[PDB]
Design a protein around this ligand. Sequence first.
Ligand SMILES: CC(=O)N[C@H]1[C@H]([C@H](O)[C@H](O)CO)OC(C(=O)O)=C[C@@H]1O
Ligand SMILES: CC(=O)N[C@H]1[C@H]([C@H](O)[C@H](O)CO)OC(C(=O)O)=C[C@@H]1O
Ligand SMILES: CC(=O)N[C@H]1[C@H]([C@H](O)[C@H](O)CO)OC(C(=O)O)=C[C@@H]1O
Lengths: 521, 521, 521
Amino acid sequence: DTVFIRETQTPILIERQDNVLFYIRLDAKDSKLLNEVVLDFSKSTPLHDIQSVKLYYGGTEALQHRDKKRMAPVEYISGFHPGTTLSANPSYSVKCAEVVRPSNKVVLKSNYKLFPGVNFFWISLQMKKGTSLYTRINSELCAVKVDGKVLDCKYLSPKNISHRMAIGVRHAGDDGSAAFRIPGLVTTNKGTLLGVYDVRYNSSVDLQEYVDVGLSRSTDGGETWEKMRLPLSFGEYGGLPKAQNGVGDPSILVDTKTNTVWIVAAWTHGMGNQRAWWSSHPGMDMNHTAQLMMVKSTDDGKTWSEPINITEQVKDPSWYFLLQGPGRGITMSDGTLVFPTQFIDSTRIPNAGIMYSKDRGKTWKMHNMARTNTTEAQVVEIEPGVLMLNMRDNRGGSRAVSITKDLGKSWTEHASSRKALNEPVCMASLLNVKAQDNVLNKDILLFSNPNTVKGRDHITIKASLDKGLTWLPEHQLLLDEDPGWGYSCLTMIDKETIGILYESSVAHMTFQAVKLTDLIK
Amino acid sequence: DTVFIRETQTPILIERQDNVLFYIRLDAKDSKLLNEVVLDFSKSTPLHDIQSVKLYYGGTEALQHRDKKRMAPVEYISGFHPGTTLSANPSYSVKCAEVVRPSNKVVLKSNYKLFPGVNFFWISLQMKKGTSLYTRINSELCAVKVDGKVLDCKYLSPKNISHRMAIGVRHAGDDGSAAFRIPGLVTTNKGTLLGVYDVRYNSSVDLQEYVDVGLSRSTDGGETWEKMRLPLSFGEYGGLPKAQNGVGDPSILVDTKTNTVWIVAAWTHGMGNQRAWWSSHPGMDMNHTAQLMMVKSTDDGKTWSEPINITEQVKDPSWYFLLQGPGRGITMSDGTLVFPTQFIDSTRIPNAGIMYSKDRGKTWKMHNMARTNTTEAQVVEIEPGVLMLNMRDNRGGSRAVSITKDLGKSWTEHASSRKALNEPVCMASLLNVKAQDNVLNKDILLFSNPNTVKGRDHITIKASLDKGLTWLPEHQLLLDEDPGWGYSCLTMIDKETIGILYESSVAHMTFQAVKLTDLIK
Amino acid sequence: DTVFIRETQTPILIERQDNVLFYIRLDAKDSKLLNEVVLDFSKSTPLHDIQSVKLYYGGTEALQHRDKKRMAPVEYISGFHPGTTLSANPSYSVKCAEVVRPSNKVVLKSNYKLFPGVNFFWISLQMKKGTSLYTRINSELCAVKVDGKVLDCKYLSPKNISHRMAIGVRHAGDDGSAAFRIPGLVTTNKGTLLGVYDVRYNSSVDLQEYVDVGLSRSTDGGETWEKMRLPLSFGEYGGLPKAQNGVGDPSILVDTKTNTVWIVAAWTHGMGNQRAWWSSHPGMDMNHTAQLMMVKSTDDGKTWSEPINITEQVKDPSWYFLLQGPGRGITMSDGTLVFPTQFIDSTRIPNAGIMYSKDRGKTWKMHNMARTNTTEAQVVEIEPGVLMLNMRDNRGGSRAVSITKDLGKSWTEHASSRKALNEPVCMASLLNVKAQDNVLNKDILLFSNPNTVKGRDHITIKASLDKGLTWLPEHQLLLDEDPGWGYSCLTMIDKETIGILYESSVAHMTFQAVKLTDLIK
Ligand SMILES: CC(=O)N[C@H]1[C@H]([C@H](O)[C@H](O)CO)OC(C(=O)O)=C[C@@H]1O
Ligand SMILES: CC(=O)N[C@H]1[C@H]([C@H](O)[C@H](O)CO)OC(C(=O)O)=C[C@@H]1O
Ligand SMILES: CC(=O)N[C@H]1[C@H]([C@H](O)[C@H](O)CO)OC(C(=O)O)=C[C@@H]1O
């Protein structure tokens, strides 16, 4: 017979009880017993870090569904059902075998009775609790033995996959919140990691709703995270319900001249239970339009000021909706702080741009839009005094890229625009790492998004060595092949290590660490 | 100004901390203060049963959404979110006022500051723990005072609403199950109430999935219910996951000759995670087709036999799918036991019919379909030896009704067929009560169904006094105007009272008691 | 083996070279030859009217598609491809046999080699050129013989089907027009039939586009139709393209006092190539909003006046769009002429109503809407001075029905609103036939539409004998089971005969005559 094998390319959550490593499907109807499955973990693998390898049985397939060649009948582990994302759903899988503290060779003896039809199996990988974020797992499926015969394997995945670790900074249901979304991430001058996100208590739906801006803080490069803080929350302001007071879509930056940290977010007041994208209207006060609120921290992110309403400084009253671009912002070489922005103009078309402060965040200003019918953007200083804006474009298919040398007074279309970086119309993260700040001593531009033109899957980091003109395939790393909500934010953990917080297929707020030399060998 | 008022016509769950009694909408944009709201409970209302009356504020509405003239911005209390259906979502409502242990006149003093636009309020009713299923609440909204002025009330709901109690036998999330569906209900010869249903552990989706048949048993007329039992469950039969072993769509009956209780259900084995409606195929064994399984109890519902597979007795091998009609079956005067049935034939068309036993349930037989393109049905003995089958009809609009005098060898279209009983294509309950068995000393046919042609809402009981020829509007009672999953099943609690177990807007398995004299005055 | 049989319930176009009478599907994989098919035509059938009966082979089915149990692999005859709707597509069917001038017993000898799998056949009925609209064909499928053996027939269609003739007054492609839509039909005082419709030259899409109002006139009760006329056409008015000058959605009425015939239609000027539903705006002139235009004929419909612009007489300036309800209007008992209407108000919501004239059509007036969120409607005088408006309702599922005794100043909800009459949100025809004007000497209310809650198919005529309170199944007639565009319009051809012009599955403008006694026996 033939045995279809599909090895996964998904984050291994350290804290998870099960992680899908392999899917196995057997089509023979005359078979009776699965004797064993044999695996081998290479010596490059930190072998002492694997707690357990298990073999699960997933049953059979509906007869009219078998033509489609699905590798499982159902999702065995959920990354989205609140409170139960850390374990395999026991009603969907039957554990057939287990090797605890495996060596290089793993022999899962099951002698399990088979259905007269399709049979599904899968291999679960469970890491030890204190495992390092840099542990990489390589695994070879050596043999599938059915009815005494070792069968021929047909692989649907590439060879030499390296499985990477992740920590779920937030999971569905944590701290009473159904969902967490829209991540931002920075590293302070002291090396502290600060990740921000929407705390969406009632559901995953956008504003308007009961939404706070939360923050996780790590002092050890992301191995552990402190209890969630709430830098922005407005409760029952004005007497209205909490769900008519949400604040979200955070963007965070570190003022590198002083280590003051800033968070800007959009506060929606009223608007029933409708979406703010359609409910924010012209005007300037909270009863008409979303409010642009900013908080700061002068103690390395531990405590946060009371919100400051900066709406009047930057919003044209004719606009329907002004808000920041989610993710992060920057400090320019000359000390200017910059936040990406987006506004819906009087004709109900969104346009991306930037706001900037030359007085350490006390006053902010917006000059002109970068491009029509664009929304979420991130910005970088690609040369001293030259800003590059990388934009979600409603035309579809690819990121728009524009340049400004005058803080947004006039814009130029970049050569890479609407060609080089494909997207499914989604948030994308851009981060420039100057030669002086990384071990390769070369300017490296990093980009992260779902590497498709349709669908939020295959979350990928890409690197450019020519200031974003070309993105060579060999300088990219696939992080998550499965579907998720798609948003991500990059930061440098240290001079040689990238950190990423993103919405993944395994956890709402997923954190991973990647050696720069893994992207650029 | 004007103040829109809408009184609810929805079950008052005794165990709930909140129940929506009134919706209130104020349109004045220039107003400043809601001073008070005044309520009155008639002297007919047992006031000693009310724990508390509350005034809640629901905020305002999106400016572009005010066209649609709803009465609230969001659903304040959920009947479907697992684990949280018994209290109002505190993020959607702000409590303004509360009167504990009210008297006839209730003054809810709030002096609550209003939004410059639409303002939503609502009144919550909380009953005491020991409240009876027969308590009636009549409530009159006397005044809404804004800025010192009593405003003009415009009511969107009729006068003389009497609010009726209910008990949630099963609620979303109970005993670890996401949902409960498909109710059946009978009264044993000892007056014991037995209610059956799907226990749908993972979600509300139909077979195939992890589904058991559960049962709730009450010896006090439905005021209290014993711990859930599982008369049918197949676990990991054959080594397949539990989710590939569901059993559901139960039908229950009482052999009135002996008080033996019978439950029949459809067991689906394998089939992946697809719907049994498409995945059950021709054949006879479990690896091909759904199995028709039966359990019995001879101790008044307390314990249950192991399942009996009767598939081979009644199923034609060419049918794709044979199953019972959910709800209940009957004992005919001559002792014949009858269960409605439905099968998908080789043409992929479903057809309703009946199966019967002449030997107290030891063997069962099926003859011919009653009507093409029909599914779920319920049956009564409308005259001696004459069965009436009332059918969900895929043509749409109304119930089909057919008669058989030879246990399904030949069928006749009934005069009421496809004209009198409107439906949105959904399960409906039918129950016949002979003159000698009820306090009105009239033969009474009872029907329960969502009283619509589209949408599963306005669950209503209808009564016919001429053996189902006519359904006069004055002999109908609205129980639940809000949306739900729509199924229901009737029984006689006693000679004076109807019991109904149904899927409601407030609980997955909702029980209510209704005096025959409320229906027939 | 088994042979699945589906007899059709669709109009037989007299002018068609082929009409599908039976679908045949054989699932046997070991069979070799279809020897023959034997048909029987009753002696009620005027046999002299059948030109030919044919047996066609339609080939096989995709292997993954077979479980769906379709009765054909493809549509054998198109009602919609311009210029090719009158013959079977010969690339989809191979002719196996033919009986020209059949007698009562028809033997189609084929000895046709069968595919080793699913095999499709079908039987074609072709009528003689001069056949009458009243001819009825009753046909029995006597035997399907495969490999010498008469097979067991499994019917998907009811017994006692009577196949009815139809004439395609307009077919896709006729007179250079891609499409014809939106029928209206009346009978003048002289018995002349007048059918009006959109002539949609470029495609089937709604205004704006190159659209005229066309008219077919018959002096022999619909057996033959005069060359198409154009009562309304605007060409390059103002110098804009013909496609920025369309007029459509006609409504026609006979002033029975004088036999003057009126047609009202909506003329859209400019608006690029967008849909008038969104492009007509507030105002009154043609450069801003659709114009309500009227023409009259005083010579029994042979010639038509130049259009009169009556917009200023009844349009409120704040409305986005005012137009007639397509179909027909009435002449009330007191001489008032009445057209149903529909307007999109300043809040972008559509509402139905009526306009009327008390001076023989010289001046027109509108009072108040009947109901919110309603569009197309038809009106009758259900009793002297009492108008019944039957409305397409955007809430879905069923017609709204309202009553006015003061020509739209005030409205009352009819008992049947949103309960009695089913609907998929589509145009529907309503026509009242007074006792003295028909042969049953009873008031008869007639209704025609797609008899579904979803999908435009099963075009059906329904009759009510109690002024629209009840619509009994026995007084209904299915005309066309297959999908079409769904609009229809009724008239009385004479005191004994209904006429209907409608969009069918076989022709854009399909005309049929139906005896009143066939509806009400
Ligand atoms: C105001 C608001 O909520 N915006 C939402 C954003 C935006 O709507 C898109 O960029 C425009 O198309 O999209 C998403 C998303 O689910 O991807 C989340 C944001 O919360
Ligand atoms: C096997 C199965 O689950 N059937 C499902 C049933 C059926 O499909 C329909 O009656 C005909 O299509 O419908 C429903 C329903 O609430 O709508 C519930 C049943 O669980
Ligand atoms: C102005 C216009 O085009 N009206 C169109 C109508 C209308 O859009 C709907 O009644 C309200 O939405 O719909 C259709 C249709 O076959 O669906 C045809 C009419 O031409």
